[PDB]
Structure formats: C-alpha cells, structure tokens
Design a protein around this nucleic acid. Structure first.
Lengths: 65, 32, 442
RNA sequence: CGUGAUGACGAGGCACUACGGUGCUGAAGCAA
RNA sequence: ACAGGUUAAUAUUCCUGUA
RNA sequence: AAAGAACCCCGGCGAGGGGAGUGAAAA
RNA sequence: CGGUAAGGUGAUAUGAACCGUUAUAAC
C-alpha cells in the first residue's frame, strides 16, 4: 500500500521542481532550438544518405523489372 | 568481456556482407 | 554450469587495444550505415514477385523493410533482449550481474537467443504469409536469406559497437526512420510532390501533404523534451601548484532530459511488434488464440486492441480502442522500465565518483570541494523520475505521438530524435577525448 | 497527585546496507 | 519557559507536549 | 616581444630534475 | 552643456557577458 503513496508523492515532488527550474530562458533563446537543430541536422544526414542509395537503386530495379 | 573462444576481425564480417550482397544482388536480379 | 560450449562457439569481434582515431571510428560507422541502406535496396531471391502488401507496424521498431535482405531487421535482437529482461526481470531467474560472470552470462546468453530468434522470426514471418507463395522449397530458401541478413546486422552492430560511434541498433533505427522520411516525402512516389502536383493539377489534396505535417508536429513535440535542462552545479577550489597552475574551479552542466526510457520503450513497442506478428502467424497457421486478422492485419482480439492506430491520420471512430492501447502501452512501459532497474540504468552509483573530484583535493593549496564523498542520496532521490516517467510519460508521448500519426512512425521519430541526439553527444565526447589521452571516464 | 500521555521513549528483535550507518516493530516501565 | 527530541556543527532559540 | 617552456621521462597524480620545443640568447 | 572619437565596460585581471564604429560607446 504505502508503496503506491510514496510513488504518487515522488511524482508530485518532481512536478514542483519543474516549476523552479525554468526562469533562465524557458529555457533559453538558444537552448531548445539547439536540440531541434542538432536533432534535425542528424536525421537529415541519415535520411539524406538513405535517399541517395535507396532511390537510385529503385529507379534501376523498376527500369529492369 | 566475452566467453567467445573464437575471435573475428571486423574486416571479415564486412567482406562477408559484401558477399551476401553480390550473391543475391545477382542471384535475384540480372535474371538469365 | 551453463550453455558455455556452443556459447564459446559463437564468434565475436576482435577488439584492438590499439589507436582507434576519431576519424576512424567515424569512417567505420559510415561503412556500416551504407551496407545497411544497401541491404535495404536488395530484394530477397524469390520468383513470386507478388507479395501481400506489407506489415505497416513492424518495420519501424525493427528497422527492417519487408521484402529485402533485411526484412527481419533488428526485430530478433530486440525480441531476444525482450525475453531476457522478462526472465532476468521478474526474478524468474534471479541474477546478480556484478561479477563479470552474470554480466557476461546475461549477455553471451542473450546473444545466442538472438540467433535463435533470428531464425524463428524468419520462419514465423513466411509462416505469417509475408510473401504469399509457401512453396516448401522456395519457402525454405527465403527463410535462409532472411534470418542470415539479420545475422549480418547482429555482427555489424558488434562492429560499430567496437569500431565506430554510437550504436548499431540505435543507429539502424534512426537510419531507417530518417530515410523513410526523406524518401516518403521527397523520393520517387514522394508525398511532397504528390501534393505539389495535386496543386498544379488543380485539385488540392489535403491528404498528400497531411502526413508530412504529421511528421513536423511530432518532431516539434518529441523534441520539446530535449529542450529543458538545469544549470547548474557547481564546484570550486584553487591553490594550484602541483607544478603547473591548478587554479581549480569546478565543472558545470547540465545534461538535458529524456533518453533513459530509450531502450525500455524500444522493447515495449517491440513487444507489440511480436504480438501482431505472432497472432497473424498463429492465425493463418492454427487457431485464433490472439485474434482474427483478415485483411492482412487484425480486426479483433488481443491483437486488435493492441495495434497502433497511426499511419496517415488519427482514428476517432473507435475511442475505446484508443483508451486500451494507451493504457496497455503505458503499463508495458512501466514493466520493461522496472525490469531495467533489476538490471541496470542511469545510476547515482557511478555519478558518485566523478561528482566528488571536479576541483582538486590534493596537497597543494586548500581548494574546496567537500561535496560530496557521502552525499549521494541527493541523486537517487532527485533521480528516479528523470529517466522515466514514463511507461505513461515516455510510453504516453510515444503512443499519443502515434494517434497524431506521422511519417516514419510517430514513435519511430521519437526514438530517432533521441538516438540522433545521444549520437551527437557521442560525437562530441569523442571530438574531445581526441585531445587529452586519459580522461576517458570523466 | 491528576492530566498532559490508549502519546513518546524504550532492552531486544525482523531488514537493507556504502559500512558513516540507516527502516518495521516493541516487553516491563512499579514500590521501599 | 519548562521537560523531552533533533544537527557533522545551533539550542530554556529549531520540532513536540505542556506553560 | 611572453613567445612564461605543448609533449615525453624519473618522482608521492609531490619537491626537484632530465629531454623536447620558444627565444638572438634559458651562459 | 562643450571637446573628442573607433573603439570601449578603472587596477592586480584574466575570462564572462555586453556597449559602440556618423551626430547619447567610452574618455
């Protein structure tokens, strides 16, 4: 029983911290955007590399199927 | 670590893979 | 005693204690990446050029691509890991890894099973009617190639894992999703065009651009998580003299938020992956234990209630269906998450050492930094949630990410975005370790 | 002396543990 | 303004019970 | 003119020192 | 209020953050 209570409390106590941790720039007129940048940049490379390989080979397969 | 009594150098797996490709890449396509 | 005999027969990868330059870890990774994409271009040798649509549900978490030399993809490896966490998780086979024994036991063992699940899935796939023509002869041939391709990955993972950057799996998944996006949106039968063309044709189709939006939205949402972050610390200390400066100050931060529940959720989604597969499989090959599929996927049964709704647009026409899934996923997430504890996870024990040195100590000077050295409980406490939180937090964001639905896979995009960032970090911790040949633990 | 207090504390046990130590419980608890 | 209790370090100052 | 000696070695992640470089010169 | 100006936010004092390059930078 108690176990559930503590678990429920921890979640609340955490939600409180999230309130204190923000000010800065919520988080910063450069931070957030960063993640999206690096993240998108990375996905672009992996995605782009896949496109090269991928699509050319498909053209040939169709044109010789 | 690993209890793999055998040791395999990556250069192989890579080349072994270039194998699967060539085989089926021709085993399938290039019909006839 | 253990399955050590055949276990010792299962090859491994030669790890050189030599100099593996950043440039080389990089160039290595890349070679793996391509052999992957490439294998995803090659169809499996099979006369029956006719295949029954596809399983729009397994590909994403599996990083596979049905009909190709990797039609099974990471699927096995994940399955395997799933069981282990299940056994070694529900205590069923209690193990205290600590010792290099249990550690290398849990591992080596799982690895094997991965090859077991490698073939099983193969057979199960064809047996689920993934290709249409069950020519016992031809069927056999296929299975061969199939599971053998997945094998190559298992070893390609090993390579990356000890010769390059990031992780095979992690990579692979991100590899697939990214492509699935760039191609789906811009490739041959690309959507951006189908939409663009539809505009020119004069009959603006909101259904061609839709899915593309779905993906932006998902990205922005799943990303919003990798934004927050404390800041941070800090430490202090000086009195340098060790024979060269030593001013001492104290590291900073922070780190970010999310990722932990990475491997966990990868397993939850993967569980469902082996259900829709295992149900259809044990459908057109037996009794409707799990559910009545028909039409390819499932339209009733455990299977039905446990099939992710995404693809193009969110389905409202079945509220209850939504509710269950969500809750179903949520809990499954909590599970594997807990099973990740009994095993291992973002641990304070480890952060202790390293958050108790940043500064000095030493003899020369009086640089402070008491920290620290007995004040860890402050982490395990503030910690718990961080990773999480979870089965509903991480599992929720993922699930809801699917209702919304997006290209590549709402959930897939998620993992990807994370994997990609944890992959950026990897590229930095490296760009630096390529200077001071020592601090390979700070 | 009542009450404060069918409360607390409390020898000792059932637990984890880094080995600084920490939780659950709990007898008697009066008189000359 | 007393008796318990508590901090690595405070104490008829903090917590409790009772003034 | 700080270019105030990267990096390597002994030594107690010392003291001190030996190389290596900076420098017209480290006489 | 006047001069002056591509440079500045006194020193040990670096860094950090900023202010200015044309007439409310600074002196």
């Amino acid at each position: 029983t108690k176990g559930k209570a503590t678990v429920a409390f921890a979640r609340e106590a955490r939600t409180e911290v999230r309130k204190v941790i923000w000010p800065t720039r919520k988080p910063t007129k450069d931070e957030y955007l960063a993640v999206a940048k690096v993240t998108a940049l990375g996905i672009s490379l992996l995605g782009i590399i896949g496109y090269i390989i991928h699509v050319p080979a498909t053209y040939i397969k169709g044109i010789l199927k | 670590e690993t209890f793999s009594k055998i040791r395999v150098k990556p250069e192989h797996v890579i080349g072994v893979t270039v194998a699967f490709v060539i085989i089926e890449a021709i085993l399938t396509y290039g019909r006839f | 005693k253990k399955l050590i005999p055949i276990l010792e027969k299962i090859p491994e990868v030669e790890l050189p204690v030599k100099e593996i330059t950043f440039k080389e870890k990089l160039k290595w990774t890349g070679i793996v990446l391509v052999l992957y994409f490439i294998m995803g271009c090659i169809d499996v040798y099979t006369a029956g050029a006719q295949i029954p649509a596809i399983f729009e549900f397994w590909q994403t978490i599996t990083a596979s691509r049905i009909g190709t030399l990797i039609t099974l993809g990471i699927g096995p490896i994940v399955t395997a890991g799933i069981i282990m966490q299940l056994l070694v998780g529900s205590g069923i086979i209690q193990m205290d890894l600590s010792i290099p024994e249990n550690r290398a036991l849990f591992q080596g063992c799982q690895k094997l099973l991965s090859i077991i699940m490698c073939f099983v899935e193969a057979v199960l796939f064809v047996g689920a009617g993934a290709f249409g023509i069950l020519t016992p002869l031809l069927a056999f041939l296929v299975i061969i190639q199939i599971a053998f391709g997945s094998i190559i990955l298992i070893y390609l993972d090993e390579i990356v894992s000890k010769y390059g950057i990031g992780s095979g799996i992690g990579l692979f998944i991100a590899a697939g999703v990214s492509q699935t996006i760039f191609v789906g949106a811009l490739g041959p039968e690309g959507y951006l065009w189908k939409f663009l063309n539809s505009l020119i044709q004069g009959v603006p189709n909101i259904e061609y651009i839709a899915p593309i939006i779905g993906t932006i939205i998902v990205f922005l949402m799943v990303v919003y998580a990798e934004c927050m972050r404390r800041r941070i610390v800090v430490n202090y200390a000086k009195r340098q003299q060790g024979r060269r400066v030593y001013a001492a100050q104290s590291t900073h931060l922070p780190l970010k938020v999310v990722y932990v529940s990475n491997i966990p959720v990868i397993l939850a989604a993967a569980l469902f992956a082996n259900i829709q597969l295992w149900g259809l499989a044990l459908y057109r090959m037996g009794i409707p234990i799990l559910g009545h599929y028909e039409g390819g996927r499932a339209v009733d049964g455990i299977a039905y209630y446990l099939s992710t709704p995404y693809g193009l647009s969110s389905v409202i026409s079945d509220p209850i269906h939504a509710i269950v899934y969500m809750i179903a996923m949520i809990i499954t997430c909590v599970m594997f998450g807990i099973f990740w504890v009994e095993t291992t996870g973002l641990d304070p024990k480890s952060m202790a050492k390293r958050i108790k040195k940043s500064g000095a100590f030493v003899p020369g000077i009086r640089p402070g930094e008491q920290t620290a050295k007995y004040i860890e409980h402050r982490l395990k406490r503030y910690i718990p949630p961080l990773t999480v939180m979870s089965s509903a937090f991480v599992g929720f964001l993922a699930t809801i990410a699917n209702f919304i639905g997006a290209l590549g896979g709402g959930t897939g995009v998620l993992l990807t975005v994370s994997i990609v960032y944890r992959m950026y970090e990897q590229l930095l911790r490296e760009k630096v370790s390529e200077l001071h040949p020592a601090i390979a633990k700070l």
